[PDB]
Amino acid sequence: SELPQMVQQLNSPDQQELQSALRKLSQIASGGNEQIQAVIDAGALPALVQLLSSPNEQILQEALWALSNIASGGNEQIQAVIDAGALPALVQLLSSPNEQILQEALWALSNIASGGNEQIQAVIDAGALPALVQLLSSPNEQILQEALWALSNIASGGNEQIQAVIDAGALPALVQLLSSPNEQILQEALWALSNIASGGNEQIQAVIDAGALPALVQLLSSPNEQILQEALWALSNIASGGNEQIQAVIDAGALPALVQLLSSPNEQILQEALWALSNIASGGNEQKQAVKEAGALEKLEQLQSHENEKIQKEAQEALEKLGGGKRKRKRKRKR
Ligand SMILES: [Ca+2]
Ligand SMILES: [Ca+2]
Ligand SMILES: [Ca+2]
Ligand SMILES: [Ca+2]
Ligand SMILES: [Ca+2]
Ligand SMILES: [Mg+2]
Ligand SMILES: [Mg+2]
Numbered sequence: 001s002e003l004p005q006m007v008q009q010l011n012s013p014d015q016q017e018l019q020s021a022l023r024k025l026s027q028i029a030s031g032g033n034e035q036i037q038a039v040i041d042a043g044a045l046p047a048l049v050q051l052l053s054s055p056n057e058q059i060l061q062e063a064l065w066a067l068s069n070i071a072s073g074g075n076e077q078i079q080a081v082i083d084a085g086a087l088p089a090l091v092q093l094l095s096s097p098n099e100q101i102l103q104e105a106l107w108a109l110s111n112i113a114s115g116g117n118e119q120i121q122a123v124i125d126a127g128a129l130p131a132l133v134q135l136l137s138s139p140n141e142q143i144l145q146e147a148l149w150a151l152s153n154i155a156s157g158g159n160e161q162i163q164a165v166i167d168a169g170a171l172p173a174l175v176q177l178l179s180s181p182n183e184q185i186l187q188e189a190l191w192a193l194s195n196i197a198s199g200g201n202e203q204i205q206a207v208i209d210a211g212a213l214p215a216l217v218q219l220l221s222s223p224n225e226q227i228l229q230e231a232l233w234a235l236s237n238i239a240s241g242g243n244e245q246i247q248a249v250i251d252a253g254a255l256p257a258l259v260q261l262l263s264s265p266n267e268q269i270l271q272e273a274l275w276a277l278s279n280i281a282s283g284g285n286e287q288k289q290a291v292k293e294a295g296a297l298e299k300l301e302q303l304q305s306h307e308n309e310k311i312q313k314e315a316q317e318a319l320e321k322l323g324g325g326k327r328k329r330k331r332k333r334k335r
Contacts (some may be wrong), residue, residue, distance in 0.1 A: 003028070003042040006097065010047040013132035016055075022051075022062035029069035030334050036073035045070070045084035052089040058100065064104035066194075067333070071111035072332040078115035083198070087112070087126035094131040099143065104133075107333060113153035114332045120157035121248035125138035129168035136173035141182060148177075148188035149331065155195035157329045163197035166239075170294070171196070172212035178215035183227065185234035190219075190230035200329045211251045213238070213252035220257035225266065233327065239279035246283040255294035262299040267308060272304070274314035281321035288322050297322065 009021035027237050030040050044066070049065035071081050074154075082308035086108070090332070093105035102333050109132075150173075159245075170192070177189035197207050205212075216238075219231035239249050254276070261273035275298075280291055300322075303315035 003044075007042045007044050007047055010044070010051065012221065015059075017061065019058060022059065022066060025221045026066040026069060028333065029066055032185070033077065034075050035071055039066075039070055040077060040080050045086075049086050049089060050190045052093065057101065061100060061104065064069075064101065064108055068104065068108040068111055069334055072114070074135065077116045078112050078119050081112060082119065082122050087122060087128075091126045091128055091131065094128070094135075103142060103146055104144070106150055107335070110146065110150035110153050111332055113150055114157075114330050117158045117161060120154055120161045123154060123241055124161060124164045126197055128163060133170045133173060134169045134176070136170065141185065144185060145158045145188060148185065148192060149333070152188060152192040152195055153330055155192055156198075156330045159199045161202060162196055162203050165196060166203060166206045171206060171212075175210045175212045175215065178212065178219070179261060182225065185224055187230055190227065190234055194230065194234040194237055195328055197234055198240075198326045201241045201245060204238055204245050206303060207238060208248045213248060213254075217252045217254045217257060220254065220261065225269065228269055229272060230275055232269065233329075236272060236276040236279055236324055239276055243284050243287060244281055246287050249280065250290045255296070257267055259294045259296050259299060260294070262303065267292065267311065268302075270311055271314065274311070274318055278314060278318040280319060281318050285324070288324075291322055 003025075006021040006025055009017050012018045025039060025044055028035055036039050048063055051059055054060050054063070067081060067086060071078055074107050088187055090105050090109055094099055095104050096105065109123060109128055113120050132147050132151050136151075138144050138147070145241055151165060151170060155162050164190060174189050174193050174241055180186045180189065193207055193212055197204050216235050220227050222231070235249060235254060239246055258273055258277055261269055264270050264273065275292060277296060279288060297319070300315050300319040304319070306315070307310050
């Protein structure tokens with residue numbers, strides 16, 4: 001209700017009147033999609049994009065915060081941000097020497113990339129990827145995390161958008177990050193490759209050719225359940241490709257580690273271990289025999305006696321597929 005009065009204050013000579021309006025519009029935009037639409041309907045977006053060119057760092061800080069929380073809404077809400085000419089201004093802020101401005105620009109770009117394929121492509125077309133791939137080599141963990149988050153959401157799009165990430169030279173940087181001692185960076189690098197591996201066979205072969213599999217197979221032996229869940233998701237998407245892709249997974253030695261995970265009392269790890277083996281089972285007779293030789297038949301048959309309906313179904317489906325004769329993830333950040 002008080003929103004139109006706030007939009008008028010975004011172009012005020014009084015700095016204390018301008019900052020109070022920005023702080024309030026940022027707090028409203030942190031709410032639901034119904035609240036975000038009220039900000040857009042008040043015509044805040046044209047005024048907010050204009051403020052990104054302001055030399056004032058305090059104004060630009062809250063202007064980015066407001067746009068980021070608006071960008072964390074629905075697909076139509078994200079589209080309204082793009083129509084206001086936000087992307088060409090956000091891409092220019094990636095080359096900024098200010099760490100707070102760069103962090104907030106990346107936060108805004110990641111939420112826009114959390115929308116549909118049309119929205120993701122608009123970010124690619126704006127020239128975001130070359131800067132994003134460059135940031136994967138940064139010594140700053142706060143910035144590296146944000147760029148990893150934005151690249152994961154772009155890779156959550158269609159095959160055209162995933163190929164654009166591969167072409168920008170992201171895979172060698174992502175594969176290198178799989179050996180990082182930082183668990184947050186490691187999780188996001190795993191989340192990025194998983195979304196890349198959810199694409200076509202050519203895109204999955206790109207992940208294999210970059211040398212990601214030895215690290216992913218190794219991560220199945222981790223005591224950390226968060227890293228285990230991400231590695232299982234990445235390998236499942238790789239195993240969903242062709243017979244060349246399934247065999248690369250077997251050659252990397254995933255089967256003995258996957259069969260070991262069938263003994264886990266954790267329902268999340270189990271479901272993902274079953275899904276990875278089920279995709280492998282949907283390969284040729286050479287691929288089917290490899291699963292049999294790993295000792296999987298014994299555990300799959302025993303898992304058909306589990307009290308969990310989902311665990312029961314997956315185990316039977318995988319055991320049937322062993323007879324002789326792809327998931328994308330998006331994340332929206334609200335602060
Ligand atoms: Ca003044
Ligand atoms: Ca600086
Ligand atoms: Ca550092
Ligand atoms: Ca660590
Ligand atoms: Ca643990
Ligand atoms: Mg950290
Ligand atoms: Mg952890």
